[PDB]
């Protein structure tokens, strides 16, 4: 996580055949508080990337196993006597650019029963009928 700064595609011209222009990587540079680092991601991230509508100066969230991008907002450096946005100029995060998070949550079996018994998905009409 951190502030995106690059949105830089790589290039190798051709995919070993008839070609236009081929990228073969996407360079994504993050900086949050502790430093800055460049990540050469899979090219497949690009679809999800403009699906999340990210641009330079935004701050994002990407998970390692899935590679799923999520936009959190944009930094407070473009804020502080600007205001007036529902997205909130979410502050520039603390800590290292790369993080390993260990979440522990306590739960009872009855909670699991109650949660799994119901159709909690809001995309179905019967859920909001509930």
């Amino acid at each position: 996580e951190g502030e995106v700064t690059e949105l830089t595609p790589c290039e190798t011209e051709n995919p070993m055949g008839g070609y236009g222009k081929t990228i073969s990587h996407v360079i994504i540079g993050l900086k949050t508080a502790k430093g800055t680092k460049q990540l050469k991601l899979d090219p497949s991230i690009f679809e999800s990337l403009q699906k999340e509508r990210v641009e330079a100066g935004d701050v994002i969230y990407i998970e390692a196993n899935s590679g799923a991008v999520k936009r959190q907002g944009r930094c407070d450096t473009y804020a502080t006597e600007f205001d007036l946005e529902a997205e909130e100029y979410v502050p520039l995060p603390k800590g290292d650019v790369h993080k390993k998070k260990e979440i522990i949550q306590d739960v009872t079996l009855h909670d699991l029963d109650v949660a799994n018994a119901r159709p909690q998905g809001g995309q179905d009409i019967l859920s909001m009928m509930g």
Binding site: T32, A33, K34, G35, L92, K94, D96
Partner: protein, 63 residues
């Protein structure tokens, strides 16, 4: 134990006058722990931060 000067000399050898002591320090601008450091006034009234080498500076960074 043989004595030593007030400086270049911790309590393991001599007098540890704290004005010569470097200690781990952190800055409010997001640049992290800078490792061991003193505060010293220079010429012109300007307050500087000295810094000292450690073999674990790579650990104090991303600590």
């Amino acid at each position: 134990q043989t004595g030593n000067w007030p400086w270049t000399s911790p309590k393991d050898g001599g007098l540890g006058d704290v004005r010569y002591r470097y200690c781990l320090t952190t800055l409010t601008v997001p640049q992290r722990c800078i490792g061991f450091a003193r505060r010293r006034v220079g010429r012109g009234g300007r307050v500087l931060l000295d810094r000292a080498h450690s073999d674990y500076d790579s650990v104090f960074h991303h600590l």
